[PDB]
Design a binder for this molecule. Structure first.
Ligand code: SF4
Ligand code: SF4
Ligand code: SF4
Ligand code: SF4
Ligand code: FES
Ligand code: FES
Ligand SMILES: [Zn+2]
Lengths: 91, 94, 181, 47, 291, 118, 159, 688
């Protein structure tokens, strides 16, 4: 799994990936990547999921909507404001 | 005209393309460029045209030495004489 | 940004439009005297917003630049610098800015040393004169300011879209007869 | 004490110095032969 | 002989290249092959001139186009299986080939094809731009590589190709002669008529009907692969699918869609593959043949 | 509403709330905030350098007001006396540490502030 | 008729073959003759209908590319037509593609009761296809025979 | 026909061809828009330009409505305000709340129009539309939830470029603009897609998450990666450069730039030489002072006889640097400015007409037939390729002699060998009659063909063909003979009069002025001493006994002459990195130390010397006409005119890697690895 391979670049949006997630500790001066990677994929029945980054409006990020009806079934989608990743509960 | 290559290192003609002050040099170049080139195959004969530019024949002899001749309102015979003098003066220059 | 044609016909206005011809003073300039003469003969005689040929004018350190304030004991490099006069148009990213641009001539100075300090990586400028651009309503005013302050100036004239016929009917066009070759 | 790393990174963000060869190196005529340091793979050359 | 399918129905698909994912109709195949033939003729190729084939399996489209164009132009092709510069030089000296088409990125031993070619012919390195080759062989005028990069003394396949114009084509294509040699495999030479006879015999033996899509795995340079592949499609209007270096697994996935479809199995491909992951994909293979 | 010492918060999951929109940098009247951002390897829009010059900053509160995700918050700490001028050049490390330490009280105040409009 | 893009399916990959039968080629020739010689771009819809008839009532991506190649038009145009028009099934359907009208006339006449009865008999929900590839339920708009409501259509053919 | 209309009661006069939007723009009243683009077709999708007309009950779309006599337009009326508010509310409905995270935060015309014309508060309180993202490659980042379905991207792709990939697939609110299948948008002009897209749905991926518009300072300069030359804007936040954009220059740039010139500036950010260096016999490089480097170079120059001194001209050489080098070599008695013998351009620098495009970049819009010889406009000067596409769609027939590249427009491939040229010259080829029939024909020849060993013969053949077929016609006052160059440095050298054919076979002292292409060990003798003026160490820094850092095009205030003869001024954006010095200053210091001081100490005096050599270079952004075109291009009697039987090829292999800056760039490497395999094809796309 070479981070500079064409397959890896295409899968990671043409960005060099860090599997260990340790380089961010220096690059962005935080372990937030490691912390967020621990949260598992949240499975949502609906095709579209609403995220506000909290329990109430103004307590998180602006209300956003994520399409879980991916052209490939079951592909998780990550929220842009927070790293939470949601996937459709295919059955 | 056959000894230009050995006598000089470069000839240049800077003039205007639509001015009577340059008409003479313009016509002389248009008529004799190919003759001079055939006489001296590999010698550099540069031609530069700029509007409202003073006619000038620049002869570069050797070791970065150049002589500039003001050829304004000069008949083709005068241009021939000036070029001949520039070519002949190479020995005196070096 | 464009007063009516020949609306102003003052001697001062004509002087502002006209650009001086250089006089060889330095030894290098005297050696290149032919070059100075050629430059004087070739460069445009007057500057107007209708001009189309760019040019560079040397600073005129003369009695005309007496109004400059940037010649002080501590700083002696601002005067005699060369500026750039051009119209800054809106970026290609967007077409309808909240604050539209292109209605004024911008005068700019090339930036000097710019270095990031070690302690925090903050950007620092060796000179504080060329941080902000200057703005003028007319190229005549910009050139007058340059002459008054003793700055040399390059002028690059604007370029705009060529007007072309536009019509929704052009979407539907009959190609022609099939047998046509 | 690790100010050098931060300073070098800040300098490289805008301009990264070229790492010149050091020590003995192979010569082909008047040329020093060094392998390319580009992490990216030359897929067209390889296949 | 090579335009019956165009006369009948040129819109029908002609050949498929699964490895490089490109499918050609009869019209497109004819256009490409005619372009190759015109390019060779313009370069000066004549009837009987020899072109060496040193292209690996992956370049199935290039192999097929070169074969058909050589057949159209009456140029004989000699496949060469050389993993060493000694073998390459021996083959070149023995054949006196006018041209050598090869795959540069292919690896032979510890060196690539382009490196071996340069080693055999050092003159290519210093050859002038647009200058004819002055080599020891005295006849290897043309060197062509099917690669992305360009090297001195070599020309790319697309650069060699020349698409003739409808009203500005001064070139001429000699009429295809059946008896003219086309392939020189080993010490045996196959003519176009003999290849056609081989195609007919193989079809009769394998019960290969018109609508049975043929699959070819491995190198397409073999005379049998040429007979049962592009040649079969151009003669009987069949549908050929080349898998190139793809193993039995990947061949199978393509195979599943096709029904009652003949498979040609390369020995090299068989040894490389370990075992069939999904034997169900071959449940409707119809018939199986071996090179 | 007291504006004390600047700090950077995180979501309950531990992810940073700061997305490099630079709204706080632009609104800072004193030009005391410097932000540089590069895409994170996972692809998040996160800053690589977030500096606040505490000596150049006027504790107005414009930064937290303009923050759209409540990333930068001027928490209640005011006993931030420093003996060295360099100690007042707060960096991303310092701001994140302040947020981690002072999250309880900051969150308690933010609860009431958010509930007031309701 | 769900997504506005290509669904990643193993049975609808680019490697799937598709070839028109000689009868389909003759029909295509007739269609082209009916349309202007230069305006071959107008034969997309008849070509798609022929593809559906030839296949199991759906248009493969390979078939769409073949149509584009035959019509000398961009494949994106064929993609746009297929996605815009809902009568083209871009994915395989069941043996019976039931299409129950749901517009106000049919709704007044009792379309909901008929839909519930169909669901009960077929042991499947609306829109979803039955476990076995036999039934596929869909809700459609006014089919035309409002005065004869409630109504259904099968395979876009029989009302 | 002039027609009188009223805008807010203000009389105005416009011809009937004008639309409402065009009349408003001419009269100075601005109208919001999202989908109307000047260079694209007319569409009425967004309907944000609705205005009020007294006699028209319905709102009228200004963009797609022609003016009518006596029209009473009320753009400031309450009805117009309500129309704008309604359209803006509909647009913002379903629009994601991504302003903080969107890269177009400060350059969003949607935000600006919502602030200026639309209402200040929204009523839509419901679930919004959600659209999956798409992968278009490493050059364009897609966030399709922000798409407004204005089809500007589709129109640009289909019209400006030949690529036909984007389309509005679907119906209703579920419609999605983009490729139906998953594929990358790898067109050479993909960068301009981001510019045309107005709502940040498509953004610059390399520039993504970097900075904001309000914290950038912009400088107008000229492109150098292509010999065509392009008017570009460089945005910088302090020392760092970012977001190179095009700027309107219809004569040369026509608002578009190529991906190379848009994303190759990253090369300047690494592998930069920042100090004079010297290499030991063992090969160990060590940094030294400018004084030491100049002193050793001057000592070598004094010791070395002028006979065995030579120079190589680099790719990015400028007028000032080449003039200084020429003067220094002349004062040292050195006259040969080439050391490479493998490939030299076969063209005389006497007349500008014989090595410049006689017909300007706009000459394609005037020619009826255009014949290319060893040229690939798609890879070299892609903007020129787009212009040729426009010309061939309006009225122009394109023929090609050489390789059959995947041009965006149909072309007639005559051949690839010199047999076609021989036949055309002899007159037996039907294309000779075709040219004679055609009016204002044009011949474009790439510099590689003239750089061939038989370049002189090919050049003479082209001259005779042009003269015989009327490409140079006095009655038509037309000169269609053109040469497309590949080296701005070579163009500058030809302008200054340096002979490209003068090659020093054996040179003991070589001065390499930033040359990195075509260098091979055989060119440099083993015993020679090499001084390399350069800015990158990819190549030429390994052949150098001494290395001198120089300035780049974004760091040097110099002059550049493009392929068509236009002389532009490249301006200083940031100073040279580290201890780098301007190349002309380095040459001046070297001359003074060696004892042959040059007569210029500043840019003004150096430009006076440039005026001495060739005055026309002092008229910036202007093409000086020449009246010696026919004389220069006239075919002489007795010339060789003997061509070789070999294919005519194109030098470009990897479009994203052509020069040292591109090779050092990272974005270009990503583009190469993401596009080379998808774009490589030995066959021709018969579809187009
Ligand atoms: S308190 Fe005000 S001045 Fe200080 S950092 Fe925050 S916004 Fe800037
Ligand atoms: S602290 Fe808030 S306003 Fe400042 S960059 Fe981060 S998210 Fe934007
Ligand atoms: S285009 Fe970007 S900045 Fe503008 S409204 Fe949409 S998300 Fe916000
Ligand atoms: S992606 Fe951008 S340019 Fe394309 S249709 Fe959507 S909003 Fe318009
Ligand atoms: S309501 Fe059923 S067909 Fe119209
Ligand atoms: S600008 Fe008028 S409809 Fe879009
Ligand atoms: Zn979220």
């Amino acid at each position: 799994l070479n981070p500079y391979s064409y397959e890896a670049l295409k899968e990671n949006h043409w960005l060099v990936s860090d599997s260990s997630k340790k380089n961010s500790e220096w690059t962005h001066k935080s372990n937030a990547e490691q912390l967020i990677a621990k949260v598992p994929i949240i499975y949502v029945d609906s095709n579209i999921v609403r995220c506000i980054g909290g329990t109430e409006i103004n307590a998180g990020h602006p209300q956003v909507y994520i399409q879980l009806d991916t052209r490939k079934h079951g592909t998780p989608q990550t929220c842009k404001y927070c790293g939470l990743r949601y996937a459709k509960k295919m059955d | 005209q056959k000894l230009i290559g050995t006598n000089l290192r470069e000839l240049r003609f800077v003039f205007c393309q639509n001015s009577q002050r340059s008409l003479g040099l313009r016509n002389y170049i248009a008529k004799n460029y190919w003759n001079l080139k055939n006489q001296n195959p590999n010698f550099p004969l540069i031609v530069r045209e700029c509007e409202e530019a003073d006619p000038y024949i620049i002869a570069r002899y050797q070791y970065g030495v150049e002589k500039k001749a003001f050829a304004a309102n000069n008949n083709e015979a005068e241009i021939e004489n000036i070029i001949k003098t520039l070519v002949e003066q190479s020995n005196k220059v070096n | 940004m464009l007063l009516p044609k020949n609306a102003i016909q003052s001697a001062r206005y004509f002087e502002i439009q006209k650009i001086p011809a250089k006089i060889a003073k330095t030894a290098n300039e005297k050696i290149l005297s032919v070059g100075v003469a050629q430059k004087n003969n070739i460069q445009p005689k007057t500057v107007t917003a209708q001009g189309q040929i760019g040019f560079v004018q040397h600073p005129q350190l003369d009695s005309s630049c007496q109004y400059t304030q940037f010649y002080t004991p501590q700083r002696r490099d601002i005067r005699g610098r060369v500026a750039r006069i051009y119209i800054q148009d809106t970026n290609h990213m967007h077409d309808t800015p909240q604050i539209p641009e292109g209605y004024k001539w911008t005068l700019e100075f090339e930036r000097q040393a710019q270095y990031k300090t070690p302690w925090m990586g903050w950007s620092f400028n060796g000179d504080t004169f060329s941080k902000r651009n200057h703005y003028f309503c007319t190229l005549e005013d910009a050139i007058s300011y340059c002459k008054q302050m003793g700055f040399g100036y390059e002028v690059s004239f604007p370029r705009s879209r060529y007007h072309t016929r536009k019509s929704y009917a052009d979407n539907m066009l009959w190609p022609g007869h099939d047998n046509a070759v | 004490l690790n100010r050098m790393r931060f300073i070098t990174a800040q300098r490289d963000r805008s301009r990264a110095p070229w790492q010149s060869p050091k020590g003995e190196g192979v010569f082909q005529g008047k040329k020093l032969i060094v392998a390319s340091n580009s992490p990216f793979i030359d897929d067209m050359s390889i296949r | 002989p090579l335009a019956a399918q165009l006369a009948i129905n040129g819109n029908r698909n002609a050949v498929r290249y699964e490895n490089q994912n490109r499918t050609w109709t009869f019209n497109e195949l004819d256009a490409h092959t005619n372009a190759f033939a015109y390019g060779l003729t313009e370069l000066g190729w004549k009837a009987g001139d020899k072109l060496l084939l040193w292209v690996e399996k992956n370049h199935t489209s290039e192999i097929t186009t070169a074969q058909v164009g050589a057949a159209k132009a009456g140029v004989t092709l000699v496949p060469i299986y050389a993993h060493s510069a000694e073998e390459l030089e021996k083959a070149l000296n023995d054949t006196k080939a006018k041209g050598l088409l090869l795959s540069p990125n292919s690896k032979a031993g510890n060196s690539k094809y382009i490196e071996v070619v340069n080693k055999v012919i050092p003159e290519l390195y210093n050859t002038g731009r647009g200058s004819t080759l002055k080599t020891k062989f005295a006849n290897l005028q043309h060197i062509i590589h099917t690669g992305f990069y360009t090297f001195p003394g070599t020309y790319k396949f697309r650069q060699i190709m020349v698409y003739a114009s409808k009203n500005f084509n001064t070139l001429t294509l000699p009429n295809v002669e059946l008896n003219a040699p086309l392939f020189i495999s080993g010490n045996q030479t196959y003519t176009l008529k003999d290849l056609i006879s081989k195609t007919e015999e193989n079809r009769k033996t394998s019960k290969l009907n018109d609508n049975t899509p043929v699959f070819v795995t491995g190198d397409s340079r073999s005379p049998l692969s040429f007979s049962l592949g592009i040649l079969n499609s151009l003669l009987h209007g069949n549908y050929s699918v080349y898998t190139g270096a793809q193993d039995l697994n990947e061949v199978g996935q393509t195979i599943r869609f096709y029904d009652n479809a003949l498979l040609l199995v390369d020995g090299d491909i068989v040894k490389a593959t370990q075992s069939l992951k999904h034997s169900e994909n071959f449940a409707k293979l119809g018939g199986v043949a071996a090179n | 509403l007291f504006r004390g010492e600047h700090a950077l918060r995180r979501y309950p999951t531990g992810e940073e709330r700061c997305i490099a929109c630079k709204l706080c940098q632009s609104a800072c009247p004193a030009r005391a905030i410097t932000i540089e951002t590069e895409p994170r390897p996972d692809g998040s829009r996160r800053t690589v350098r977030y500096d606040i010059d505490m000596t150049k900053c006027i504790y107005c509160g414009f930064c937290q007001e303009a923050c759209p995700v409540d990333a930068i918050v001027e928490g209640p700490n005011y006993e931030q006396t420093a003996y060295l001028h360099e100690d007042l050049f707060y960096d991303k490390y310092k701001l994140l540490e302040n947020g981690d330490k002072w999250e309880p009280q900051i969150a308690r105040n933010i609860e009431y502030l958010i509930n007031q409009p309701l | 008729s769900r997504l506005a893009a290509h669904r990643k399916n193993d049975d609808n990959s680019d490697s799937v073959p598709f070839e028109f039968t000689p009868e389909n080629y003759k029909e295509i020739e007739k269609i082209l003759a009916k349309y202007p010689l230069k305006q071959k771009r107008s034969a997309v819809m008849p070509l798609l209908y022929l593809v559906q008839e030839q296949n199991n009532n759906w248009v493969p991506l390979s078939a769409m590319k073949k149509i584009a190649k035959l019509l000398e038009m961009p494949e994106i145009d064929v993609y746009e037509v297929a996605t815009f028009y809902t009568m083209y099934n871009r994915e395989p359907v069941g043996k019976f593609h039931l299409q129950i009208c749901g517009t106000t006339p049919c709704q007044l006449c009792g379309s909901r009761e008929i839909t519930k009865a169909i669901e009960e008999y077929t042991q499947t929900k609306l829109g979803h296809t039955s476990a076995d590839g036999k039934w596929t339920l869909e809700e459609v708009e006014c089919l035309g025979a409002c005065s004869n409501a409630p109504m259904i259509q099968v395979n876009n053919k029989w009302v | 026909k002039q027609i009188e209309i009223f805008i807010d009661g203000k009389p105005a006069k416009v011809d009937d061809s004008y639309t409402i939007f065009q009349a408003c723009y001419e009269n100075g009243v601005i109208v919001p828009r999202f989908c109307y683009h000047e260079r694209l077709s007319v569409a009425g999708n967004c309907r944000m330009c609705l205005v009020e007309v007294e006699n028209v009950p319905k709102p009228v779309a200004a963009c797609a409505s022609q003016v009518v006599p006596g029209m009473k337009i009320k753009t400031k009326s309450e009805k117009t305000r309500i129309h704008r508010g309604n359209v803006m509310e509909f647009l913002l409905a379903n629009h994601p709340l991504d302003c903080p995270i969107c890269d177009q935060g400060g350059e969003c015309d949607l935000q600006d129009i919502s602030s200026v014309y639309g209402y200040g508060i929204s009523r839509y309180n419901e679930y919004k539309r959600a659209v999956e993202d798409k992968n278009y490659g490493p050059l364009v980042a897609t966030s399709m939830n922000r798409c407004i379905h204005c089809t500007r991207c589709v129109r640009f792709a289909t019209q400006i470029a030949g690529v036909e990939d984007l389309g509005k697939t679907g119906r209703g609110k579920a419609a999605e603009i983009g490729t139906y299948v998953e594929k990358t948008f790898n067109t050479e002009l993909s960068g301009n897609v981001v510019d045309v897209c107005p709502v940040g749905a498509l953004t610059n991926a390399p520039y993504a998450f970097t900075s904001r518009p309000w914290e950038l300072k912009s400088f107008y300069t000229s492109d150098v990666f292509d010999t065509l030359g392009s008017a570009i804007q460089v945005d910088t936040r302090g020392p760092e450069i970012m977001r190179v954009l095009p700027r309107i220059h219809e004569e040369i740039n026509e608002e578009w730039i190529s991906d190379k010139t848009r994303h190759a500036f990253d090369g300047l950010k690494r592998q930069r030489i920042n100090s004079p260096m010297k290499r030991s016999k063992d090969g160990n490089y060590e940094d030294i002072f400018w004084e030491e480097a100049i002193q050793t170079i001057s000592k070598k120059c004094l010791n070395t006889p002028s006979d065995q001194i030579g120079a190589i001209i680099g790719e990015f050489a400028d007028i000032e640097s080449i003039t200084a080098l020429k003067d220094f070599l002349n004062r040292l008695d050195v006259d040969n400015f080439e050391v490479r013998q493998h490939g030299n351009l076969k063209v005389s620098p006497d007349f500008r007409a014989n090595y410049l495009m006689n017909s300007k970049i706009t000459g394609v819009e005037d020619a009826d037939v255009l014949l290319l010889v060893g040229c690939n406009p798609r890879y070299e000067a892609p903007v020129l390729n787009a212009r040729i596409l426009k010309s061939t769609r309006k009225n122009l027939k394109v023929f090609n002699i050489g390789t059959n590249q995947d041009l965006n427009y149909k072309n007639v491939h005559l051949g690839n060998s010199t047999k076609v040229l021989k036949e055309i010259a002899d007159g037996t080829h039907p294309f000779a009659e075709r040219l004679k029939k055609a009016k204002l024909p044009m011949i474009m020849v790439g510099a590689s063909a003239l750089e061939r060993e038989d370049g002189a013969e090919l050049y003479n053949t082209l001259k005779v063909i042009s003269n015989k077929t009327g490409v140079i016609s006095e009655e038509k006052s037309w000169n269609g003979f053109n040469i497309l160059h590949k080296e701005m440095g070579r163009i500058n050298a030809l302008e200054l009069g340096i002979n490209p054919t003068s090659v020093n076979k054996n040179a003991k002292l070589v001065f390499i002025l930033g040359a990195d292409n075509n260098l091979r060990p055989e060119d440099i003798p083993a015993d020679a001493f090499v001084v390399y003026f350069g800015t990158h160490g990819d190549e030429g820094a390994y052949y150098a006994d001494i290395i001198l850092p120089t300035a780049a095009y974004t760091e040097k205030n110099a002059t550049w002459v493009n392929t068509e003869g236009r002389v532009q001024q490249g301006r200083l954006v940031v100073m040279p990195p580290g201890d780098a010095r301007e190349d002309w200053q380095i040459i001046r210091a070297l001359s003074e130390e060696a004892g042959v001081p040059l007569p210029y100490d500043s840019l003004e005096e150096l430009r006076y010397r440039v005026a001495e050599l060739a005055p026309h270079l002092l008229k910036y952004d202007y093409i000086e006409p020449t009246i010696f075109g026919k004389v220069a291009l006239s075919a002489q009697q007795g010339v060789k005119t003997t061509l070789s039987p070999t294919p005519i090829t194109d030098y470009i292999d990897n479009f994203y890697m052509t020069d040292a800056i591109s090779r050092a760039s990272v974005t270009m490497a990503k583009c190469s690895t993401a596009f080379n395999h998808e774009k490589f094809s030995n066959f021709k796309n018969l579809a187009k």
